[PDB]
Ligand binder design. Structure first.
Ligand SMILES: [Ca+2]
Ligand SMILES: [Ca+2]
Ligand SMILES: [Ca+2]
Ligand SMILES: [Ca+2]
Length: 575
DNA sequence: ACAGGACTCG
DNA sequence: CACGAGTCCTGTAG
């Protein structure tokens, strides 16, 4: 029943200076993907245009790229990237309903117009799954079905903009959408489109080496088990360990990592199995899985950054996930050798905040002892050891620093004696003694942890530095485990989330500076608390001064932000 | 197709 | 594997 014009040519009344716009890409991965239809709703009416028509039309292309022609959209980054791949610029997106819904309630999991519309009780639009199907079944329907769905989405966007903006304003989140998340979305769209170049021969050679090691370790494991079995099967493995070999059952059977490390002394087989799984992971995911997704023409990978998924305001990255490339262990770290700059004589430059979370905590809690440590640029883990174990700097042993570091991680995650006990393999009572010593040395952090839990209870939510919000309705649960989990969220979310606001802001500031300096440098990746760029070799020295400074200056805290930076011919070398 | 259990990362 | 993510394999399922 929704009225529109199924236009067959583009007309001027479709080029109003305010419209809701739908540029539909049905494939889940939108990189180089078809645009299946276009709907426009504005003061003059509702329109559907076939894309071969509209995108071949120079006036429509000019309206798309005209920043004074304001568009309201859902997931403008998807339309933007798919248009970049056809060489078309999208500008003037003044309202993005996906990002508005995300700031209003990240727990909604809003992934289509219908889910966002639900939040204001607008129901005159169907969910995308209902129209398109699921997986194998996911298909573009016939024109009359397609066209009505797209026009309904655009009409929903047109109606919904105002109440969303009203709520964002009451929440004091209007600048967060307009000055942070929307500008960031255009930056992420450039990053994704630029992609990261992969050295595929280097990956194939690492793969060959791994297949050889895996073979030797597999053979060893069979020798030690006196049997053939599927090592990748936690079921078959648990039979081999706890039944055939009679190993102690400390925690059907669990063969997790924590468990196998405690088991390692009882039998040669355990360490071999842990080494197998680690290599098997490099092999299947970071060699095989990565090669499946590099473009065979350009040899680039083009991640998709999900800007509206995490509950704390962080990004995620998929297909591939470039925020979880190995680094911890040397053999996996070599994978980073396959990530190279995209031009001859360019280099990779990586800059990263040092302990941004603890620095945010110092600021938010205003703990005198913590703020002073950072003002002195002390090694925060050594200092925490000195305070909780009551010794001088030179009396801090490595084991002591290891344990104080675990307390610091605990503190930011929202501490509990059970979680620190499990992390450190000590008793609950032992872990509680450390936590008590910690709070005696940082009473501001204690005050803060108490206050933020009671504030989560009175307000129903907690906020970050730039007014991001997470609702915590389980904070009043009569169930202990559920309530504890919400209390940890209350303690952690302002910290993890504020660190996410700062880095997002640094990205915006950085991109403005690069353009103001007309440097060729550009962002490739964000990894939570670090930015990775490529640039000509000749820009390096300017980058060393410009990047850290932008990152350090993104916000003003009561403690300084510290940034280390490195560069080299591959991602691996930018260390 | 989907969950559980493993691994990766900040 | 505490807080926050994502991908691959196995085995059970339809
Ligand atoms: Ca024309
Ligand atoms: Ca980092
Ligand atoms: Ca400062
Ligand atoms: Ca790191």
């Amino acid at each position: 029943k929704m009225a529109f014009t199924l236009a067959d040519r583009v007309t001027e009344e479709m080029l109003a200076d305010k419209a809701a716009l739908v540029v539909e890409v049905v494939e889940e991965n939108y990189h180089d993907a078809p645009i299946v239809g276009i709907a426009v709703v504005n003061e003059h009416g509702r329109f559907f245009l076939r894309p071969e028509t509209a995108l071949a039309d120079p006036q429509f292309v000019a309206w798309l790229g005209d920043e004074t022609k304001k568009k309201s959209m859902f997931d403008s980054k998807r339309a933007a990237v798919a248009l970049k791949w056809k060489g078309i610029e999208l500008c003037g997106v003044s309202f993005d309903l996906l990002l508005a819904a995300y700031l209003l309630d990240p727990a909604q999991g809003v992934d289509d117009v219908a889910a966002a519309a639900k939040m204001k009780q607008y129901e005159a639009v169907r969910p995308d799954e209902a129209v398109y199907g699921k997986g194998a079944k996911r298909a573009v329907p016939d024109e009359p079905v397609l066209a009505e769905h797209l026009v309904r989405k655009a009409a929903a966007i047109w109606e919904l903009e105002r109440p969303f903006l009203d709520e964002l304003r009451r929440n004091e989140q209007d600048r967060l959408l307009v000055e942070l998340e929307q500008p960031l979305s255009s930056i992420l769209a450039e990053m994704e489109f630029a992609g990261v170049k992969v050295d595929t021969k280097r990956l194939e050679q690492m793969g060959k080496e791994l297949a050889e090691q895996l073979g030797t370790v597999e053979q060893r494991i069979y020798e030690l088990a006196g049997q053939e079995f599927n090592i990748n099967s936690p079921k078959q493995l648990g039979v081999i360990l706890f039944e055939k070999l009679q190993l102690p059952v400390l925690k059907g059977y669990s063969t997790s990592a924590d468990v196998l490390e405690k088991l390692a002394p009882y039998h040669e087989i355990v360490e071999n199995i842990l080494h197998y799984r680690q290599l098997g992971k490099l092999q299947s995911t970071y060699i095989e899985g990565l090669l499946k997704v590099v473009r065979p023409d350009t040899k680039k990978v083009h991640t998709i950054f999900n800007q509206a998924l995490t509950q704390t305001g962080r990004l995620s990255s998929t297909e591939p996930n470039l925020q979880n490339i190995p680094i911890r262990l040397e053999e996996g770290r070599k994978i980073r050798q396959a990530f190279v700059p995209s031009e001859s004589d360019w280099l990779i430059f990586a800059a990263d905040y040092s302990q941004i979370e603890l620095r945010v905590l110092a600021h938010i809690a205003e703990d005198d002892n913590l703020m002073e440590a950072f003002r002195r640029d002390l090694d925060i883990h050594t200092k925490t050891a000195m305070d909780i174990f009551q010794v001088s700097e030179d009396e801090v042993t490595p084991n002591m620093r290891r344990q104080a570091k675990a307390v610091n991680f605990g503190i930011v995650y929202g501490i509990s004696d059970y979680g620190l006990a499990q992390n450190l393999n000590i008793s609950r009572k032992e872990a509680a003694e450390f936590i008590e010593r910690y709070f005696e040395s940082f009473p501001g952090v204690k005050r803060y942890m108490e206050n933020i839990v009671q504030e989560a209870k009175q307000k129903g939510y907690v906020t970050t530095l730039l007014h991001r919000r997470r609702y915590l309705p389980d904070i009043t649960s009569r169930n202990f485990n559920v309530r504890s989990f919400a209390e940890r969220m209350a303690m952690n979310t302002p910290i993890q989330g504020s660190a996410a606001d700062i880095i997002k802001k640094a990205m915006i500031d950085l991109n403005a500076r690069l353009k103001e300096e007309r440097l060729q440098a550009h962002l490739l990746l964000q990894v939570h608390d670090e930015l990775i760029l490529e640039a000509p070799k000749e820009e390096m020295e300017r980058l060393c001064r410009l990047v850290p400074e932008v990152m350090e200056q993104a916000v003003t805290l009561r403690v300084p932000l510290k940034v280390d930076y490195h560069y080299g011919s591959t991602w691996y070398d930018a260390k």
